Amino acid sequence: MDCSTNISPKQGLDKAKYFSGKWYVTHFLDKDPQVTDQYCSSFTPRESDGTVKEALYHYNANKKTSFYNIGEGKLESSGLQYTAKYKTVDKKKAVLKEADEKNSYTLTVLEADDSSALVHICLREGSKDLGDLYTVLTHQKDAEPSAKVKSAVTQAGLQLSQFVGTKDLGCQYDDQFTSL
Ligand code: HEM
Protein backbone atom coordinates (compact mmCIF):
# COMPACT_ATOMS: atom_id res chain seq x y z
CA MET A 1 0.00 0.00 0.00
CA ASP A 2 1.15 3.58 -0.66
CA CYS A 3 -0.19 6.53 1.28
CA SER A 4 -2.25 9.08 -0.66
CA THR A 5 -0.03 11.51 -2.57
CA ASN A 6 -1.94 14.80 -3.08
CA ILE A 7 -1.92 15.74 0.56
CA SER A 8 -0.90 19.11 1.94
CA PRO A 9 -2.31 21.26 4.76
CA LYS A 10 -4.85 23.94 4.04
CA GLN A 11 -3.09 27.31 4.17
CA GLY A 12 -4.70 30.03 6.21
CA LEU A 13 -5.91 27.54 8.86
CA ASP A 14 -5.93 28.98 12.38
CA LYS A 15 -4.14 26.56 14.63
CA ALA A 16 -6.09 27.73 17.68
CA LYS A 17 -9.10 25.99 16.06
CA TYR A 18 -7.24 22.67 15.59
CA PHE A 19 -5.24 22.53 18.85
CA SER A 20 -8.30 22.84 20.96
CA GLY A 21 -10.72 20.83 23.07
CA LYS A 22 -10.77 17.18 22.15
CA TRP A 23 -11.64 15.39 18.92
CA TYR A 24 -13.93 12.39 18.31
CA VAL A 25 -13.80 10.64 14.91
CA THR A 26 -17.35 10.60 13.39
CA HIS A 27 -16.34 9.06 10.00
CA PHE A 28 -13.25 7.26 8.67
CA LEU A 29 -12.00 6.22 5.21
CA ASP A 30 -9.34 3.52 5.45
CA LYS A 31 -7.69 2.68 2.15
CA ASP A 32 -6.39 -0.84 2.77
CA PRO A 33 -6.91 -2.10 6.34
CA GLN A 34 -4.41 -4.79 7.37
CA VAL A 35 -6.91 -6.01 10.04
CA THR A 36 -10.69 -6.36 9.73
CA ASP A 37 -11.76 -5.02 13.19
CA GLN A 38 -13.36 -1.52 13.09
CA TYR A 39 -12.15 1.12 15.54
CA CYS A 40 -13.37 4.28 17.20
CA SER A 41 -10.86 7.01 18.17
CA SER A 42 -10.52 10.23 20.17
CA PHE A 43 -7.45 12.41 20.83
CA THR A 44 -6.39 15.70 22.37
CA PRO A 45 -3.79 17.64 20.46
CA ARG A 46 -1.70 20.53 21.95
CA GLU A 47 1.12 22.62 20.45
CA SER A 48 3.92 24.74 21.94
CA ASP A 49 6.72 26.39 19.98
CA GLY A 50 6.15 24.15 17.00
CA THR A 51 6.11 20.92 19.04
CA VAL A 52 2.93 18.88 19.11
CA LYS A 53 2.00 16.43 21.92
CA GLU A 54 -1.27 14.45 21.72
CA ALA A 55 -2.96 11.87 23.91
CA LEU A 56 -4.49 9.24 21.52
CA TYR A 57 -7.20 6.65 22.24
CA HIS A 58 -8.41 3.63 20.12
CA TYR A 59 -11.48 1.43 20.84
CA ASN A 60 -11.71 -1.94 18.99
CA ALA A 61 -15.51 -2.09 18.28
CA ASN A 62 -15.42 -5.84 17.54
CA LYS A 63 -13.39 -7.05 20.59
CA LYS A 64 -14.48 -4.16 22.86
CA THR A 65 -11.00 -3.39 24.14
CA SER A 66 -8.98 -0.21 23.96
CA PHE A 67 -5.36 0.95 23.62
CA TYR A 68 -3.52 4.21 24.32
CA ASN A 69 -0.59 6.22 22.90
CA ILE A 70 1.12 9.65 23.16
CA GLY A 71 2.37 11.16 19.88
CA GLU A 72 5.02 13.82 19.68
CA GLY A 73 6.15 15.71 16.60
CA LYS A 74 7.29 18.96 15.02
CA LEU A 75 5.18 21.20 12.85
CA GLU A 76 6.33 21.38 9.18
CA SER A 77 7.13 24.78 7.52
CA SER A 78 4.05 23.97 5.36
CA GLY A 79 1.47 24.78 8.11
CA LEU A 80 -0.69 22.35 10.09
CA GLN A 81 1.21 19.21 9.26
CA TYR A 82 3.42 17.07 11.52
CA THR A 83 5.25 13.79 11.62
CA ALA A 84 4.91 12.16 15.10
CA LYS A 85 6.80 9.33 16.82
CA TYR A 86 4.72 7.68 19.56
CA LYS A 87 4.86 6.16 23.01
CA THR A 88 2.60 3.23 23.93
CA VAL A 89 0.99 3.83 27.37
CA ASP A 90 -1.61 2.27 29.77
CA LYS A 91 -4.88 3.98 30.76
CA LYS A 92 -2.99 5.95 33.52
CA LYS A 93 -0.37 7.21 30.98
CA ALA A 94 2.38 4.98 32.37
CA VAL A 95 4.94 4.39 29.52
CA LEU A 96 5.08 0.82 28.16
CA LYS A 97 6.89 0.93 24.93
CA GLU A 98 9.15 3.75 24.10
CA ALA A 99 8.89 5.95 20.96
CA ASP A 100 11.44 4.92 18.39
CA GLU A 101 13.01 6.16 15.18
CA LYS A 102 11.29 3.89 12.71
CA ASN A 103 7.54 3.96 13.61
CA SER A 104 5.80 7.27 12.88
CA TYR A 105 2.60 8.91 11.59
CA THR A 106 2.19 11.97 9.47
CA LEU A 107 -0.99 14.05 10.14
CA THR A 108 -2.19 16.75 7.76
CA VAL A 109 -5.05 19.13 8.59
CA LEU A 110 -7.29 19.60 5.56
CA GLU A 111 -9.94 21.75 7.27
CA ALA A 112 -10.73 22.98 10.77
CA ASP A 113 -13.40 25.31 12.15
CA ASP A 114 -15.03 26.03 15.53
CA SER A 115 -16.81 22.62 15.72
CA SER A 116 -15.24 20.21 13.23
CA ALA A 117 -12.12 19.13 11.26
CA LEU A 118 -10.90 16.88 8.45
CA VAL A 119 -7.44 15.30 8.76
CA HIS A 120 -5.39 12.79 6.81
CA ILE A 121 -3.06 10.27 8.58
CA CYS A 122 -0.24 8.15 6.99
CA LEU A 123 1.07 5.43 9.35
CA ARG A 124 4.54 4.12 8.53
CA GLU A 125 6.98 1.54 9.80
CA GLY A 126 10.48 1.79 8.38
CA SER A 127 10.32 1.86 4.62
CA LYS A 128 6.69 0.75 4.54
CA ASP A 129 3.47 2.82 4.42
CA LEU A 130 1.13 0.83 6.82
CA GLY A 131 -2.11 2.88 6.99
CA ASP A 132 -3.73 5.65 5.02
CA LEU A 133 -6.75 7.23 6.81
CA TYR A 134 -8.97 10.25 6.37
CA THR A 135 -11.04 11.15 9.51
CA VAL A 136 -13.87 13.60 10.08
CA LEU A 137 -13.62 15.06 13.62
CA THR A 138 -16.11 16.79 16.00
CA HIS A 139 -15.66 18.12 19.56
CA GLN A 140 -18.42 15.95 21.11
CA LYS A 141 -19.40 12.27 20.61
CA ASP A 142 -22.04 12.04 17.84
CA ALA A 143 -22.12 15.83 17.09
CA GLU A 144 -22.84 16.59 13.41
CA PRO A 145 -19.90 17.68 11.31
CA SER A 146 -20.12 21.27 9.94
CA ALA A 147 -21.14 22.13 6.42
CA LYS A 148 -17.64 23.54 5.92
CA VAL A 149 -16.05 20.16 6.77
CA LYS A 150 -18.53 18.17 4.56
CA SER A 151 -17.46 20.52 1.79
CA ALA A 152 -13.76 19.81 2.46
CA VAL A 153 -14.45 16.05 2.02
CA THR A 154 -15.93 16.65 -1.41
CA GLN A 155 -13.07 19.08 -2.16
CA ALA A 156 -10.52 16.30 -1.23
CA GLY A 157 -12.06 14.23 -4.06
CA LEU A 158 -13.93 11.86 -1.71
CA GLN A 159 -17.53 10.80 -1.05
CA LEU A 160 -18.60 11.14 2.63
CA SER A 161 -21.02 8.20 2.13
CA GLN A 162 -18.05 5.87 1.42
CA PHE A 163 -16.63 6.55 4.91
CA VAL A 164 -17.50 4.23 7.84
CA GLY A 165 -19.67 6.23 10.25
CA THR A 166 -18.66 5.36 13.87
CA LYS A 167 -22.06 6.13 15.50
CA ASP A 168 -23.21 2.59 14.55
CA LEU A 169 -20.14 0.84 16.03
CA GLY A 170 -21.23 1.14 19.68
CA CYS A 171 -18.17 3.22 20.53
CA GLN A 172 -16.95 3.57 24.15
CA TYR A 173 -14.54 6.42 25.05
CA ASP A 174 -12.31 7.09 28.01
CA ASP A 175 -12.78 10.85 28.65
CA GLN A 176 -10.51 10.75 31.72
CA PHE A 177 -7.63 9.57 29.56
CA THR A 178 -8.08 12.34 26.99
CA SER A 179 -8.41 15.10 29.60
CA LEU A 180 -5.14 17.04 29.41
C1 HEM B 1 -11.79 5.93 13.69
C2 HEM B 1 -10.53 6.24 13.30
C3 HEM B 1 -9.35 5.27 13.28
C4 HEM B 1 -9.30 4.01 12.89
C5 HEM B 1 -10.46 3.21 12.32
C6 HEM B 1 -7.94 3.51 13.05
C7 HEM B 1 -7.48 2.24 12.77
C8 HEM B 1 -6.30 1.69 13.20
C9 HEM B 1 -5.91 0.27 13.13
C10 HEM B 1 -6.82 -0.83 12.54
C11 HEM B 1 -4.70 0.18 13.70
C12 HEM B 1 -3.87 -1.11 13.89
C13 HEM B 1 -3.93 -1.54 15.35
C14 HEM B 1 -3.25 -2.86 15.56
O1 HEM B 1 -3.89 -3.84 15.18
O2 HEM B 1 -2.11 -2.95 16.11
C15 HEM B 1 -4.28 1.50 14.13
C16 HEM B 1 -3.10 1.86 14.74
C17 HEM B 1 -2.63 3.13 14.98
N1 HEM B 1 -3.29 4.34 14.72
FE1 HEM B 1 -5.30 4.40 14.27
N2 HEM B 1 -7.18 4.50 13.59
C18 HEM B 1 -7.98 5.62 13.73
C19 HEM B 1 -7.54 6.86 14.08
C20 HEM B 1 -6.24 7.27 14.32
C21 HEM B 1 -5.80 8.64 14.61
C22 HEM B 1 -6.72 9.90 14.72
C23 HEM B 1 -4.50 8.56 14.85
C24 HEM B 1 -3.49 9.63 15.29
C25 HEM B 1 -3.80 10.89 15.45
C26 HEM B 1 -4.07 7.21 14.69
C27 HEM B 1 -2.80 6.76 14.90
C28 HEM B 1 -2.49 5.42 15.02
C29 HEM B 1 -1.22 4.94 15.56
C30 HEM B 1 0.00 5.79 16.01
C31 HEM B 1 -1.32 3.44 15.47
C32 HEM B 1 -0.25 2.38 15.89
C33 HEM B 1 -0.37 2.04 17.36
C34 HEM B 1 0.50 0.81 17.66
O3 HEM B 1 1.11 0.17 16.80
O4 HEM B 1 0.60 0.47 18.80
N3 HEM B 1 -5.15 6.44 14.38
N4 HEM B 1 -5.28 2.38 13.80
From Swiss-Prot:
One of its GO terms (biological process) is vasodilation. GO terms for cellular component: extracellular region. GO terms for molecular function: histamine binding; metal ion binding; nitric oxide binding; toxin activity. Changing V25E: Reverses orientation of heme cofactor. The keyword Cell membrane does not apply. Gene3D superfamilies: 2.40.128.20. Heme binds at H58. Disulfide bonds join C3-C122, C40-C171. InterPro entries: Calycin, Nitrophorin, Nitrophorin_domain. Keywords: Blood coagulation cascade inhibiting toxin, Disulfide bond, Heme, Hemostasis impairing toxin, Iron, Metal-binding, Platelet aggregation inhibiting toxin, Secreted, Signal, Toxin, Vasoactive, Vasodilator. It is found in: Secreted. The keyword Metal-binding applies. Salivary gland (at protein level). Heme-based protein that deliver nitric oxide gas (NO) to the victim while feeding, resulting in vasodilation and inhibition of platelet aggregation. Reversibly binds nitric oxide (NO). Also binds tightly to histamine, which is released by the host to induce wound healing. Exhibits anticoagulant activity. Inhibits interaction of activated host coagulation factor IXa (F9) with phospholipids. Inhibits factor IXa (F9)-catalyzed activation of factor X (F10) in the presence of calcium and phospholipids irrespective of the presence or absence of factor VIIIa (F8). Interacts with human and rat coagulation factor IX (F9) (inactive and activated) in the presence of Ca(2+). Demonstrates antithrombotic activity in rat models of thrombosis. Belongs to the calycin superfamily. Nitrophorin family. This is Nitrophorin-2. The lineage of its organism: Eukaryota, Metazoa, Ecdysozoa, Arthropoda, Hexapoda.
